Amino acid sequence: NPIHDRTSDYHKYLKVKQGDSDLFKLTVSDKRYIWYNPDPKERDSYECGEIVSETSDSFTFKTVDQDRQVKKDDANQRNPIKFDGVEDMSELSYLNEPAVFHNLRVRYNQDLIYTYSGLFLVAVNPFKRIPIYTQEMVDIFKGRRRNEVAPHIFAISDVAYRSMLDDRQNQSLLITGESGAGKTENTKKVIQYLASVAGRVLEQQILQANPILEAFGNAKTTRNNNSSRFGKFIEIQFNSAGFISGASIQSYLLEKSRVVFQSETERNYHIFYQLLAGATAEEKKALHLAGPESFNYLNQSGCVDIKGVSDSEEFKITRQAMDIVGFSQEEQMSIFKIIAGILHLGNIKFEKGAGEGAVLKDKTALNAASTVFGVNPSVLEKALMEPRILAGRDLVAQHLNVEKSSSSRDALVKALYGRLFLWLVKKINNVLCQERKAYFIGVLDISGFEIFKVNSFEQLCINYTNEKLQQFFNHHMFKLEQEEYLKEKINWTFIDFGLDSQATIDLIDGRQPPGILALLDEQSVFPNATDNTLITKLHSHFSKKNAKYEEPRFSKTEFGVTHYAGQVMYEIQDWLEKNKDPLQQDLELCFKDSSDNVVTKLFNDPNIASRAKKGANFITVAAQYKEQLASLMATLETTNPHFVRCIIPNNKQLPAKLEDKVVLDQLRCNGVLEGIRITRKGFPNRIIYFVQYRFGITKIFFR
Numbered sequence: 055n056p057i058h059d060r061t062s063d064y065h066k067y068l069k070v071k072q073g074d075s076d077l078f079k080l081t082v083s084d085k086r087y088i089w090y091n092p093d094p095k096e097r098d099s100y101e102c103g104e105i106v107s108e109t110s111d112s113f114t115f116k117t118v119d120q121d122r123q124v125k126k127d128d129a130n131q132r133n134p135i136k137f138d139g140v141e142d143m144s145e146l147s148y149l150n151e152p153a154v155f156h157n158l159r160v161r162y163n164q165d166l167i168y169t170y171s172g173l174f175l176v177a178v179n180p181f182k183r184i185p186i187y188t189q190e191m192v193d194i195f196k197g198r199r200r201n202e203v204a205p206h207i208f209a210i211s212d213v214a215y216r217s218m219l220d221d222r223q224n225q226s227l228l229i230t231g232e233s234g235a236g237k238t239e240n241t242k243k244v245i246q247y248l249a250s251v252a253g254r255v256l257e258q259q260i261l262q263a264n265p266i267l268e269a270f271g272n273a274k275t276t277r278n279n280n281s282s283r284f285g286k287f288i289e290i291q292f293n294s295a296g297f298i299s300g301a302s303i304q305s306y307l308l309e310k311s312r313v314v315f316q317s318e319t320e321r322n323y324h325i326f327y328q329l330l331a332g333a334t335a336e337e338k339k340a341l342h343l344a345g346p347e348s349f350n351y352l353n354q355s356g357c358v359d360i361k362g363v364s365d366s367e368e369f370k371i372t373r374q375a376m377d378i379v380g381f382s383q384e385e386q387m388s389i390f391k392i393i394a395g396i397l398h399l400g401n402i403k404f405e406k407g408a409g410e411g412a413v414l415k416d417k418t419a420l421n422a423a424s425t426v427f428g429v430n431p432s433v434l435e436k437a438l439m440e441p442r443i444l445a446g447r448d449l450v451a452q453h454l455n456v457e458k459s460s461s462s463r464d465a466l467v468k469a470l471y472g473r474l475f476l477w478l479v480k481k482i483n484n485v486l487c488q489e490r491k492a493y494f495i496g497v498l499d500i501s502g503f504e505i506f507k508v509n510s511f512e513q514l515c516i517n518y519t520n521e522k523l524q525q526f527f528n529h530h531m532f533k534l535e536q537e538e539y540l541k542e543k544i545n546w547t548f549i550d551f552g553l554d555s556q557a558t559i560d561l562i563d564g565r566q567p568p569g570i571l572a573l574l575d576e577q578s579v580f581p582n583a584t585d586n587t588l589i590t591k592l593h594s595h596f597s598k599k600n601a602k603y604e605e606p607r608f609s610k611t612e613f614g615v616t617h618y619a620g621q622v623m624y625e626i627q628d629w630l631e632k633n634k635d636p637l638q639q640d641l642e643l644c645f646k647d648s649s650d651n652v653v654t655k656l657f658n659d660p661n662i663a664s665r666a667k668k669g670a671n672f673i674t675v676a677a678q679y680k681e682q683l684a685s686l687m688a689t690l691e692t693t694n695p696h697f698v699r700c701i702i703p704n705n706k707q708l709p710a711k712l713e714d715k716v717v718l719d720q721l722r723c724n725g726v727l728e729g730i731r732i733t734r735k736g737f738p739n740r741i742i743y744f745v746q747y748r749f750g751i752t753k754i755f756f757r
């Protein structure tokens with residue numbers, strides 16, 4: 055049994071190393087210690103000081119360098135060192151910030167990235183490979199109770215699986231974290247584990263879905279070299295016997311704007327680099343491809359390579375995944391034609407004509423795009439610069455200037471890419487959905503909280519999604535838990551854990567009074583609206599009124615929202631157009647006539663191509679966002695949730711570099727210490743009267 059065998063890999067990689075006699079000496083010491091701030095300005099930078107004396111209300115302790123005094127009520131005592139490395143921190147004698155951080159630090163120093171924090175798992179990103187996810191590791195966890203084995207993402211996965219069987223109830227695994235924290239990597243491990251322990255081709259296809267989604271939906275940002283630019287909820291489906299019977303991927307709104315623009319040092323989606331790097335000699339000839347430097351959509355950020363990544367090798371992996379999932383050779387070629395055509399479209403250079411209208415003097419890129427997409431270049435050209443619209447009921451050809459022609463070209467590109475992405479997901483789902491499920495375990499992997507030098511509409515929706523997920527944790531850990539105690543009248547005094555995202559949520563998504571998204575929508579159908587009338591409206595409603603909103607004095611085009619994870623300043627430029635998400639009908643007519651079997655589906659299949667109406671306007675992105683989020687939240691409320699809190703160690707994507715204030719900020723806004731306290735102070739288990747304890751109105755509550 056590897057669990058008891060101290061030579062095993064399990065012991066080596068998942069267990070705290072045996073301390074030595076010098077450490078035993080320290081462990082049985084009568085000395086007592088405190089965590090203190092050498093600099094009272096720097097509340098997150100702690101050192102250890104020996105407590106040398108005490109009064110009834112104070113401690114005196116030595117500093118690393120001198121003696122200081124502190125009220126006992128303000129003291130962060132250090133735990134006896136026998137607790138250092140503890141697997142479940144609800145066991146600590148002293149639950150404070152530097153103690154919780156210290157335990158995570160001891161474990162992390164030994165590459166022990168997983169730690170329990172009472173009922174939920176904490177996962178600190180190692181930023182290096184640790185060999186704890188082999189089949190041999192999977193096999194050790196299979197069937198084991200949480201307290202029988204070391205902390206691991208596999209153990210929580212197994213717990214949910216047995217709960218699903220024993221309780222005949224759907225489960226969810228909700229993996230939280232800021233950008234780069236490890237949500238996607240842990241999501242993949244859960245799927246790996248479930249497919250293995252409950253498996254019977256289908257399993258291999260479930261796994262191979264991932265390189266396809268990542269190639270098209272992930273990109274280098276300044277926060278993560280492999281950032282998910284779309285959120286997903288993966289349902290792993292099980293029959294009544296508990297075997298895997300299928301899977302379904304709900305994908306959420308994709309950051310389409312990245313196709314046409316990337317900030318300095320970032321990349322576009324990985325697939326662009328993968329094609330250019332990995333294509334055959336005359337794949338490249340057939341698609342008129344050159345290197346990334348030659349394409350406007352890949353040559354702006356100054357970054358075309360990711361350290362440690364071979365895009366040509368990744369392309370091979372993407373294509374192998376497409377084969378396994380079952381995309382035909384013709385389908386793959388059309389996918390790649392769409393990618394190439396998008397790059398060509400980006401190379402179209404509109405110029406001023408004799409008048410205000412734009413012209414295309416060089417048609418090389420137009421012609422190359424049209425050839426690969428299988429559309430008529432003359433029709434495309436007219437649709438870009440001279441699209442027809444109604445004015446009342448009259449049909450009027452516009453003549454767009456350079457900036458509008460360029461923005462229409464970008465709108466086409468983003469629609470092609472977003473529709474392509476939806477089509478990939480649909481094709482995958484058709485393969486993976488082969489049986490009506492009896493049960494599911496859903497794994498949620500959102501785009502995580504993020505802050506850049508410039509934050510736009512996409513960042514607000516992303517950060518709002520993270521705020522809502524944190525609120526879901528708060529609801530389940532604190533609110534529902536105490537509501538139950540209180541309804542069962544079990545002698546409980548209600549505790550205000552001071553974690554409530556409600557104010558920020560209402561600010562963003564309020565309906566009456568209208569919140570930010572509501573006002574955005576109102577401005578979006580207002581014919582005279584501009585990005586300036588929009589910001590003016592937001593300030594008018596919220597400035598000096600809403601405690602989570604700030605009208606900055608340093609800018610006229612930004613507003614601040616205080617999120618659980620910190621204040622973010624949002625730039626309003628392009629929000630009206632981003633929300634309306636327009637696309638000239640004439641461009642759709644052009645592509646509806648494509649000779650390509652995949653391109654034609656993107657434009658004629660209503661599930662991919664149609665857009666809902668709300669009265670006399672197309673549904674806005676904000677309304678679409680809201681619908682998708684409401685849908686997810688409704689599904690989650692039908693499951694039993696399990697939470698995994700991913701924690702990023704630093705903001706450099708480096709191993710062995712745990713940063714105090716980076717980590718402590720997350721422990722605070724995540725509610726980790728609050729979550730430990732409710733575990734300790736409360737009554738986790740209750741049973742209708744069955745036939746340290748509490749008798750309720752209908753149930754016996756226990757610890």
Ligand SMILES: Nc1ncnc2c1ncn2[C@@H]1O[C@H](COP(=O)(O)OP(=O)(O)O)[C@@H](O)[C@H]1O
Pocket residue numbers: 179180181182183184231232233234235236237238239240278280281282502700
């Ligand atoms: N458990 C892990 N083992 C090894 N590397 C990891 C682990 N978790 C995260 N990483 C590294 O951190 C990067 C970002 O993690 P990821 O899961 O993509 O973040 P996100 O939370 O943004 O989905 C990964 O690409 C990988 O290099």
Ligand SMILES: Cc1cccc2c1C(=O)[C@]1(O)CCN(c3ccccc3)C1=N2
Pocket residue numbers: 283284285286305306307308309310499500501511512515516519675679682683686
């Ligand atoms: C998880 C989730 C649920 C509902 C909507 C979501 C997400 C998400 O996590 C996202 O798919 C990530 C990006 N995003 C988005 C992109 C552009 C504009 C607006 C939003 C997201 N929207």
Ligand code: VO4
Pocket residue numbers: 231232233234235237238277278280281282283500501502503
């Ligand atoms: O960087 V992550 O968007 O995958 O949170």
Ligand SMILES: [Mg+2]
Pocket residue numbers: 237238239280281282499500501
């Ligand atoms: Mg991710």
Ligand SMILES: [Mg+2]
Pocket residue numbers: 507
């Ligand atoms: Mg600024």
